Every structure is written in C-alpha cells, then in structure tokens.
Amino acid sequence: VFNRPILFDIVSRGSTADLDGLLSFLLTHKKRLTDEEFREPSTGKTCLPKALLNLSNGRNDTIPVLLDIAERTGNMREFINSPFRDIYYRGQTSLHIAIERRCKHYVELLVAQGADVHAQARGRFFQPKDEGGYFYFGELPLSLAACTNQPHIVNYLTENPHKKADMRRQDSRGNTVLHALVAIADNTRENTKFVTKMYDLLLLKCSRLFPDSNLETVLNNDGLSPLMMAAKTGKIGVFQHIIRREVTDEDTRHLSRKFKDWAYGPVYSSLYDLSSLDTCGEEVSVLEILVYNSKIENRHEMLAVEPINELLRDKWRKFGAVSFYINVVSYLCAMVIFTLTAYYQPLEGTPPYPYRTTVDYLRLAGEVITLFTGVLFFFTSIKDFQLLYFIYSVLVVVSAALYLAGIEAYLAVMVFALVLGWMNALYFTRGLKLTGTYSIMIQKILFKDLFRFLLVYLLFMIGYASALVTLLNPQSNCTVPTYPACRDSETFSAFLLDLFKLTIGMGDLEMLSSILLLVTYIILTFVLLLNMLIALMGETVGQVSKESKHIWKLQWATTILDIERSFPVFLRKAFRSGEMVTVGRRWCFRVDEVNWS
Amino acid sequence: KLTIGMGDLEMLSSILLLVTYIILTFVLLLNMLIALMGETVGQVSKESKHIWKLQWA
Amino acid sequence: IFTLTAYYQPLEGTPPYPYRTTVDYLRLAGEVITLFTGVLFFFTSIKDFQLLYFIYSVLVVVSAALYLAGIEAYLAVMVFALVLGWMNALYFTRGLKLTGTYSIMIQKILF
Amino acid sequence: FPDSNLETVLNNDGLSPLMMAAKTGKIGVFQHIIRREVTDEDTRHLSRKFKDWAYGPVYSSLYD
Numbered sequence: 052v053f054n055r056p057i058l059f060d061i062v063s064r065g066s067t068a069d070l071d072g073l074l075s076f077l078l079t080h081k082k083r084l085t086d087e088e089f090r091e092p093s094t095g096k097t098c099l100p101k102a103l104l105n106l107s108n109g110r111n112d113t114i115p116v117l118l119d120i121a122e123r124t125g126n127m128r129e130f131i132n133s134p135f136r137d138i139y140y141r142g143q144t145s146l147h148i149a150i151e152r153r154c155k156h157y158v159e160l161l162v163a164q165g166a167d168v169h170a171q172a173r174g175r176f177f178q179p180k181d182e183g184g185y186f187y188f189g190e191l192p193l194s195l196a197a198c199t200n201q202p203h204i205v206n207y208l209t210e211n212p213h214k215k216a217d218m219r220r221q222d223s224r225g226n227t228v229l230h231a232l233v234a235i236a237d238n239t240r241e242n243t244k245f246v247t248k249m250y251d252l253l254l255l256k257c258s259r260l261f262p263d264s265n266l267e268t269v270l271n272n273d274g275l276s277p278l279m280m281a282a283k284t285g286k287i288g289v290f291q292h293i294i295r296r297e298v299t300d301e302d303t304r305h306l307s308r309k310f311k312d313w314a315y316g317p318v319y320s321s322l323y324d325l326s327s328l329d330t331c332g333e334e335v336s337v338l339e340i341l342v343y344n345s346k347i348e349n350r351h352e353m354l355a356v357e358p359i360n361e362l363l364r365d366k367w368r369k370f371g372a373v374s375f376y377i378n379v380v381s382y383l384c385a386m387v388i389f390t391l392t393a394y395y396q397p398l399e400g401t402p403p404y405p406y407r408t409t410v411d412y413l414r415l416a417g418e419v420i421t422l423f424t425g426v427l428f429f430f431t432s433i434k435d436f437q438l439l440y441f442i443y444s445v446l447v448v449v450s451a452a453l454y455l456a457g458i459e460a461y462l463a464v465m466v467f468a469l470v471l472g473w474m475n476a477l478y479f480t481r482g483l484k485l486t487g488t489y490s491i492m493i494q495k496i497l498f499k500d501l502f503r504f505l506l507v508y509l510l511f512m513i514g515y516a517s518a519l520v521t522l523l524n525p526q527s528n529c530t531v532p533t534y535p536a537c538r539d540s541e542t543f544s545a546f547l548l549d550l551f552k553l554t555i556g557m558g559d560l561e562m563l564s565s566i567l568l569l570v571t572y573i574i575l576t577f578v579l580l581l582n583m584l585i586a587l588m589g590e591t592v593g594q595v596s597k598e599s600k601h602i603w604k605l606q607w608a609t610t611i612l613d614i615e616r617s618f619p620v621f622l623r624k625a626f627r628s629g630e631m632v633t634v635g636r637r638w639c640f641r642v643d644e645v646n647w648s
Numbered sequence: 649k650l651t652i653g654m655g656d657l658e659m660l661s662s663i664l665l666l667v668t669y670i671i672l673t674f675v676l677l678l679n680m681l682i683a684l685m686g687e688t689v690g691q692v693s694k695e696s697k698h699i700w701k702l703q704w705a
Numbered sequence: 706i707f708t709l710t711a712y713y714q715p716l717e718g719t720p721p722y723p724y725r726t727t728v729d730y731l732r733l734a735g736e737v738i739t740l741f742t743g744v745l746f747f748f749t750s751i752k753d754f755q756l757l758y759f760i761y762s763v764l765v766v767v768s769a770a771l772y773l774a775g776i777e778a779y780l781a782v783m784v785f786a787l788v789l790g791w792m793n794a795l796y797f798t799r800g801l802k803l804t805g806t807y808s809i810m811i812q813k814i815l816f
Numbered sequence: 817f818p819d820s821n822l823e824t825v826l827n828n829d830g831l832s833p834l835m836m837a838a839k840t841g842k843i844g845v846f847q848h849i850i851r852r853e854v855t856d857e858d859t860r861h862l863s864r865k866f867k868d869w870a871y872g873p874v875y876s877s878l879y880d
C-alpha cells in the first residue's frame with residue numbers, strides 16, 4: 052500500500068477495517084501481494100507468516116482476508132509458499148508456522164486453499180544442535196507436526212481431501228518422519244512415551260496406506276533406518292520399544308517384532324524377531340553399531356534391552372567360547388615359541404644364517420613360526436588393543452629383517468616385541484575371572500603418567516645438578532654423578548640422572564654425600580613422588596568401582612563379536628531361524644521368560 | 649627376584665632398552681600388587697556379618 | 706629457560722659478570738628473561754597460589770642481586786626459586802584433565 | 817516510584833540486595849532474585865528473566 056512496516060503493524064494488531072479498500076489500491080496500482088517491497092528483504096517475511104506468528108490466542112481472523120487478496124491479486128500459491136531467503140532460517144512456509152503454533156484452526160484453511168506440504172525447512176536454525184542449529188524435526192510439515200506433538204495436525208494432513216504429505220518422503224538428510232521422531236527423542240519419561248506412541252501411530256498409518264513395505268525400512272543418507280539410528284544416537288526409550296513392537300490385527304501384524312510362540316502356564320516363550328541385530332557379517336547390524344560405537348551414552352542398558360543380551364549369551368554358547376579358548380591356547384603357544392627363540396638367540400655373535408644343527412633347526416622353526424605369525428598379524432591389522440598390535444607386528448617384522456641382515460645388537464627390538472606380545476596377550480584376558488581391568492588402569496597410566504613422572508624427575512635431576520655446580524664450585528678427579536665446573540669437571544648429567552632414578556626408584560643407593568638446601572630438596576622430591584604415586588592409586592581405585600559389571604559385559608561382547616567377525620559368519624553358525632510364511636523366513640530368536648500372571 | 653623382591657640388590661650394570669624394561673617391570677608389578685589389594689579390599693566389605701556367622705556356625 | 710640457565714650456571718666460580726661468548730651470551734639472555742619475568746611477577750603480585758608466588762618473585766630477585774654481586778655458593782636460592790616455580794606451575798593445572806587436586810592434598814600437607 | 821526500583825539502593829558496605837544475598841550465602845532468595853519477571857509493563861522494567869522467542873519445544877530465556 053504505502054510501506055511494509057505499516058502492513059506488518061496492522062497485521063500484528065489484527066485490524067481489518069484499515070485493510071479494506073487497500074486491496075483495490077493494490078489492484079489498481081499494478082502490485083502483487085508477493086512483491087518484494089511487501090516482504091522484508093532479509094528474512095523474506097510476508098504479512099501472512101507475521102500474522103501466523105502473532106496469534107492472539109489463535110483468533111487472528113485477518114489472515115483469511117490476506118489470502119483473499121492473495122488470489123485476487125492473481126498470485127496465491129507462491130504467496131502461501133513464501134520461503135525465507137535468510138541463512139538463520141529458510142523454507143519456513145506458512146505451513147510450518149501454523150503447525151508449530153499448536154493451532155490447527157488456520158492450518159486447515161491454509162492447506163485447503165493450497166499450500167505445499169513438502170516445503171523443505173533447510174535452514175541453519177533447523178539443523179541439529181551439533182551442526183549449528185537449534186531444533187531439528189525432519190524439515191517437513193508432517194514431521195514438524197509429529198515431532199512438535201501435534202497428532203491432530205498429522206491426522207488432518209495425512210488424510211485431508213486436499214494434498215497429503217507422503218510419509219515416505221524424506222528431507223535432504225534422507226530422514227523420513229520416523230528418523231526425525233527418533234532424533235528428538237530423549238531418555239526422559241514423558242518424551243519417550245509420547246515419541247513411542249507417535250512412532251506406533253505413524254508406522255501403523257503408513258502400513259495401512261501401503262502394506263507392501265513398512266516405513267521403517269527407508270534408510271537415510273548415512274544408511275541407518277530408525278532402529279539403528281536410535282541405537283547409534285544413544286536413545287533408550289524409543290529403542291526399548293522399537294525392539295519389542297507387536298501389533299494385533301494381521302493386516303498390520305507383519306511389522307511386529309516380539310511375536311508369541313507358545314505358553315505352558317507360567318512359562319512364556321517370546322519369539323523376538325531380531326532380523327537386524329546381527330547380519331552374520333553381510334551388512335550393518337544393530338549389535339555391531341551398539342557395541343563398537345564409542346558415541347553411545349546409554350550402552351549399559353541398551354545392551355541389556357533383552358534380545359541383545361540373550362543373543363550375546365547364545366553366541367557365547369555356540370562358537371563363542373571354543374574360539375576364545377583356542378585363541379588363548381594358540382597365542383600363549385606363539386608367545387612361548389617366541390620367548391624360547393628369544394632366550395636361545397643364536398650364539399657366537401654375527402648371526403646372519405647360523406641355523407646349522409638339530410636344536411638350532413628347531414630354533415629356526417620357532418623363529419619362522421614367529422615371523423609367519425607376525426606377518427599374519429600385520430595382515431589381520433591392516434586388511435581389516437589394535438595399535439599396540441600393529442606395533443608388535445611391525446617390530447617383529449623389523450627384527451626378522453635385521454636378523455636376515457645379520458646385524459649385531461639389533462636383535463634387541465625383537466625382545467621388545469616379545470615383551471609387547473606378552474603385554475599384548477591382555478586382549479584375551481577380559482572374559483573369564485572378570486579380569487582385564489589391569490588393562491583399564493594401565494590404559495589410564497600410559498604416556499600420561501610415564502612422562503609426568505619423567506618430566507618431574509628430569510626437573511629434579513637438573514635442579515640437583517645445578518645445586519652441585521653452584522654450591523660445590525667455590526685434584527678432586529671428578530665424581531661419577533656430575534661434579535663442579537672448573538678443573539675440567541664438566542662431567543655429564545646422565546650419571547646423576549640414573550643415580551636419582553634408582554636411588555628414589557626404591558633405595559639401592561649410596562645417597563651422594565654432596566647440604567641443607569640439598570637435603571631439603573631430596574626430602575621435597577620424596578614428598579612429591581609419594582604424592583604422585585599414592586594419589587594416582589587413589590584415582591585408579593576411586594574409578595572402576597570394583598570393576599563394575601557394565602565393563603565386563605562390554606568387553607565380553609566385544610570379544611564375542613571380534614570372534615565372529617574373524618571368520619565368515621554367514622556359514623551354518625548363525626542365530627536361530629523361525630516361522631516360514633504368514634508370520635514370517637524372518638529369522639527369530641526365542642527367549643523363554645516365566646511369569647505368574 | 650630379590651632385586652624387585654624389595655631392593656637388597658646390586659642393579660647389574662649391564663642400557664636404554666634394558667633400563668626401560670626394568671622400569672616396565674616395576675610398573676607392571678606395582679600394578680599387580682596394588683590392584684590385587686584393590687580387589688581384596690573392595691570385596692569382603694569390612695568382612696561382612698554373614699561371613700562371621702557362617703564360619704561360627 | 707630458568708631450568709637451563711640454572712643447570713648451565715656460569716662456570717669457573719666467581720661469576721660476577723662472566724658473560725663472554727655466544728653460548729654464554731644466550732645463557733645471559735635466559736637469565737635476563739628470568740629476572741624480567743621475576744620483577745613482572747613482583748609487580749603483578751603487589752600491584753594487584755599468591756603467597757608462594759610472591760616468594761618465588763622475591764627469591765629470584767635476591768638471586769639476581771647476589772649474582773650481580775658475584776658471591777659464591779649464593780646462586781643456590783636461585784635453584785630453590787626454580788624448584789618453587791616448578792611447584793608454582795600448579796596454579797594452571799586446575800582445568801583440563803580435572804587435575805590439581807594434588808594441590809589440595811599438598812595444601813593440607815604443608816608445614 | 818517507577819523512576820528507580822528499590823533494589824538499587826546500596827548499603828554502607830555497598831552491596832545492594834542481590835550482592836548481599838550472594839555474599840551472605842543465601843540461595844532461596846538468590847535463585848529467585850536472579851529469575852524475577854513481572855507481567856505488567858509499568859512494573860516489568862524491573863524484571864530479569866525476559867523472554868526472547870520460542871520455536872515449540874525450545875525456549876530462549878533472555879537473562880538480564
């Protein structure tokens with residue numbers, strides 16, 4: 052009419068008398084309700100979305116007049132489809148605003164007049180919290196209604212006489228409504244309950260509309276599908292449900308999981324349909340994602356959902372423990388045949404090719420077994436406790452190469468590879484006896500503590516040599532652990548370095564008699580190192596907390612799955628199958644639970 | 649045994665690999681011992697009362 | 706640069722002004738950096754782990770003064786200021802890694 | 817007196833109610849005084865926890 056601000060103020064106030072006649076002025080002035088000057092150049096906001104976000108308790112009756120002007124001006128469809136060109140927002144057509152406002156009164160007329168129900172809200176503000184946004188819902192009006200708790204809006208949009216939003220349609224991320232509805236889910240009570248309810252509603256509706264394929268199958272750009280996405284993101288409330296979903300009516304029962312097999316009074320055989328909790332190495336599986344992935348925040352309970360835990364139990368029973376025990380036997384054997392080939396190292400010096408006699412031939416047999424296992428380990432580490440394992444393999448390879456070169460004092464990284472292989476055998480010791488927490492504590496220790504102690508110890512060595520050179524300098528023939536400066540007494544630090552190491556490495560010392568500063572300084576390092584050590588023991592014991600049960604369960608599962616991934620699982624060693632047709636073959640896992648209902 | 653059995657040693661002067669290796673066994677045995685003390689103290693839990701009752705019976 | 710200027714303490718005894726050569730000039734550079742940081746620390750401590758900090762600053766100042774006086778067996782509070790500055794760096798280690806509780810326990814220990 | 821809210825007046829030690837509650841160790845009064853919002857505009861200026869905007873289940877509280 053005259054300027055955009057007055058239009059915005061009028062629509063916010065909701066006055067209709069002033070708007071009257073202005074439409075005639077626009078028509079006579081050759082103006083369109085979608086013209087740029089009517090829309091803010093930054094956000095592209097139009098009068099209609101402004102009214103739709105200024106609801107006076109959901110009774111701003113001006114918007115119908117605006118739509119009337121819109122089709123009168125000749126441009127209505129694009130007027131309803133008013134994408135925001137800014138970066139903070141985007142898309143955000145009238146439908147998103149109306150649906151989000153928890154008001155279906157305007158949504159009905161907005162859709163009926165004709166509004167794109169496939170508008171992509173592809174803006175920064177709509178991305179997940181991590182990717183720079185604030186609210187992620189699926190970038191679609193239907194997924195917006197479902198996520199933002201507007202089931203009535205969903206029912207109207209999916210079954211309106213006008214255009215309907217197909218559920219299978221997926222946003223740029225390839226989500227579909229189910230993926231997004233999983234995304235917003237948390238581990239709370241009300242949110243989880245509502246999300247599972249809407250999930251069941253939406254899945255049933257899609258199945259009824261298209262029984263050929265349930266909506267859950269559709270995979271996203273990352274290729275997860277709702278179940279695996281819930282497993283990866285750390286969801287529990289939605290996860291616990293989606294894995295125990297059963298439906299009554301046969302026409303929509305096929306999409307069930309927790310079938311029923313039979314009952315014998317107080318014993319119930321629930322036939323869980325774990326069709327994607329293990330793929331036998333063929334494809335991605337929910338169990339592998341749940342366990343290997345480190346981003347999981349609720350892995351403890353998620354492992355113990357029920358079918359997963361009993362599936363791991365069964366895997367342990369058949370071809371899960373025999374492999375474990377033969378693995379430890381083989382590894383202890385291949386480490387003993389390395390130990391005995393290390394201590395029996397070829398004699399005489401210069402061992403390029405000293406294998407001559409029967410005992411020496413047996414030593415060669417042991418060495419070749421070690422090298423073969425080393426190269427096999429290399430392949431298993433690159434072809435597929437993994438970095439320490441690559442280190443072991445490369446060290447043994449270097450040792451074998453140097454031995455073939457017959458180079459002196461270089462069969463000493465071979466012994467280091469041996470001792471590594473002896474601390475490398477802690478991979479196995481994570482199952483029986485609930486052992487392996489030594490691995491956790493030493494993992495905490497590593498370089499962190501090693502170089503912390505080493506740097507404080509160099510600190511004290513250097514300060515102490517400084518004390519000697521600054522207090523004692525005022526024929527001598529030099530003292531071994533560093534000495535004053537003149538008389539050609541430069542000496543070296545390393546001697547006092549090892550002296551301080553072993554002396555405060557548990558005594559076995561001479562306590563160099565050069566005093567007040569020096570003795571107080573030695574006392575100070577006593578206190579500091581005692582602190583360091585017992586404090587570190589304090590954190591180690593304070594954590595773990597009796598080694599916990601989640602820990603042992605997790606490493607036990609990891610050992611299982613590593614065992615299965617070792618060999619081709621698709622062979623006749625897979626999880627139990629079930630019913631052929633009608634119910635299914637839909638390989639099923641049968642769990643028996645006794646109840647006194 | 650005796651040298652890492654609580655000192656009373658001469659520390660055979662043969663170096664880098666050997667000294668790092670001796671340090672490594674220090675760390676490993678200290679772990680073993682204090683970790684074992686950790687399981688022992690973490691269990692029993694002040695010796696419990698069920699225990700004493702059971703052996704008394 | 707204080708540790709390396711402590712262990713490389715001027716040789717020959719009687720070090721009033723022994724800075725002569727290139728390596729010794731670099732040692733002088735380190736020592737002057739230490740003294741400058743010490744006086745800056747003094748100002749930041751009086752102009753505004755604070756008492757230990759004033760102790761470090763005053764000890765380094767005393768050490769620099771005695772060195773300028775070239776007095777024997779008195780570049781030994783300088784090494785004490787060095788070791789203090791090495792236990793003085795626990796002010797920082799209270800953030801990442803949730804460390805610094807060593808500071809709390811040693812605070813309980815003290816005298 | 818809408819010219820100045822009473823909370824501004826400082827004591828001899830110069831604290832004002834919020835800082836005095838913070839210093840003395842109060843929590844119940846402190847948790848409130850820092851999240852105090854008023855409805856009517858004539859007395860809304862003395863509010864702290866304004867409201868900026870909402871996008872459904874996300875609320876941007878504009879603490880003053």
Ligand SMILES: CC(C)C[C@H](NC(=O)c1cc2ccccc2s1)C(=O)N1CCN(C(=O)[C@H](CO)NS(=O)(=O)c2ccc(Cl)cc2Cl)CC1
Nearest residue numbers: 374378379381382385424431436437440478479613614617
């Ligand atoms: C084929 C399966 C029936 C058994 C398979 N193990 C082997 O084929 C062996 C090869 C050799 C060679 C010489 C001596 C002993 C063995 S055992 C197996 O079970 N897995 C293979 C994939 N895995 C791996 O690649 C990690 C790499 O980190 N294996 S490991 O670190 O080297 C290890 C650790 C403990 C034990 Cl106690 C045995 C092994 Cl190996 C683990 C799980």
